[PDB]
Ligand binder design. Structure first.
Ligand SMILES: Cc1cc2nc3c(=O)[nH]c(=O)nc-3n(C[C@H](O)[C@H](O)[C@H](O)COP(=O)(O)O)c2cc1C
Ligand SMILES: Cc1cc2nc3c(=O)[nH]c(=O)nc-3n(C[C@H](O)[C@H](O)[C@H](O)COP(=O)(O)O)c2cc1C
Ligand SMILES: [Cl-]
Ligand SMILES: [Cl-]
Ligand SMILES: [Cl-]
Lengths: 218, 219
């Protein structure tokens, strides 16, 4: 439990860190807790379509620099780097969704019902089976939930972070797949995040005002 | 604001998706503004904040949604607050939308030209978002899922229950909300929703994949 003022200050204190102290490393305990915040995240129909690559290998980090302009300095100095993958071809009738149902412990009639629920959602409600990319982006949207909670959970632990889109996705995919780090038919890169301890004061928040981003329908 | 690893874990564990709300309990105006603030303060790619939070308290409007909102059809009645998050359509690097983005960063003329080439690279080449309208909308949509997550977590921290909602016909929803004059359908479309309030059944146990299945370590 937190007060209103603390809840606010938690989201004011979290800022995108572009300069890490290279003399400070996150403890294994603290980082596993950050990862737990991602794994515990909610996801459409319990799909959990994420995978978290923790890239600590200096050599691999250096390989990413030339195509990762968004984090080119952070690559060198951050404690931890997480590249989040999202599941490809996450169709209602896929072995992937066979597992989803197995985790939910559904019997045979419930599974035919769940499947008709997933079919209408993908095909008609959200029109996700348009092409390969729309279905992938649906899973990727769920991984942005994990991303957000990892940033928030880290900040609560006193750990700074930066979410990262600033890299060439085709090359990053090829780089990690060539390392044998995932099956390029099953997964692709969604988004990444650095973690560590900042070296500079937090810059104050610049957002649109509440009255511009909220519309009340009474 | 600081928490032990024990409390952080409990924070993300205590947050569950509630399907059954108690219609007696209503969130205070102070608490719910706090929840909204969690979305508004969320990070977003190049600071684009491409969301809009529609707060649907109108009881008549909530019923009109039920016939195509199977994911929340019971919840529409009993939940305290309902949020439909919109994402910006066609948030191209060269759009008026990105004129505002740059002004909020206080960029000068030289800084704006450099930023514009950075956005163009990001959208056109690094992320390949400009192939069509839907890929570019979906990118903004992804950023709104960050505001979604943080509103759930902030709600949880205040003792307030939530449920994220994709279970509705998007076309019918976009149409319904746009006909009610709630947004410009050329400028925004529905991205995701979320109900807020207090639960009426017990919190359920979490079924997640193992940490060993979802984490791959590269040391
Ligand atoms: C998905 C996404 C990707 C981002 N990619 C980058 C990036 O690659 N490099 C960078 O320095 N910041 C990046 N940012 C951080 C944003 O620029 C930042 O969140 C925004 O300016 C608001 O500032 P704040 O996070 O300090 O509140 C990204 C943010 C998000 C959520
Ligand atoms: C984007 C999103 C959409 C969801 N859509 C629905 C929905 O339509 N109806 C619903 O009751 N739950 C919905 N869920 C809830 C998930 O099924 C639920 O989060 C998951 O099974 C994990 O349980 P937990 O959130 O209680 O940990 C959605 C979740 C998310 C993140
Ligand atoms: Cl950087
Ligand atoms: Cl400092
Ligand atoms: Cl509008």
């Amino acid at each position: 439990q937190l007060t209103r003022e603390q809840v606010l200050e938690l989201f004011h204190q979290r800022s995108s860190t572009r300069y890490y102290d290279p003399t400070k490393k996150i403890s294994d305990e603290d980082f596993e807790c950050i990862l737990e915040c991602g794994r515990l995240s909610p996801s459409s129909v319990g799909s959990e379509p994420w995978k978290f690559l923790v890239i600590q290998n200096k050599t691999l980090r250096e390989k990413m620099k030339p195509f990762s302009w968004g984090m080119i300095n952070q690559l060198d100095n951050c404690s931890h780097l997480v590249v989040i993958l999202a599941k490809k071809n996450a169709r209602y009738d896929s072995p992937f969704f066979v597992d989803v149902m197995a985790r939910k412990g559904l019997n045979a009639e419930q599974q035919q019902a769940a499947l008709t629920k997933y079919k209408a959602l993908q095909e008609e409600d959200m029109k996700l089976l348009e092409n390969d990319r729309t279905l992938f982006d649906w899973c990727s949207k769920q991984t942005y939930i994990a991303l957000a909670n990892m940033l928030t959970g880290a900040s609560a632990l006193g750990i700074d972070s930066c979410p990262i889109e600033g890299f060439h996705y085709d090359k990053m995919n090829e780089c990690l797949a060539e390392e044998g780090l995932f099956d390029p038919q099953e997964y692709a890169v969604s988004v990444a995040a650095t973690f560590g301890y900042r070296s500079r004061d937090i810059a104050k928040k610049s957002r649109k005002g509440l009255d511009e981003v909220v519309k009340w329908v009474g």
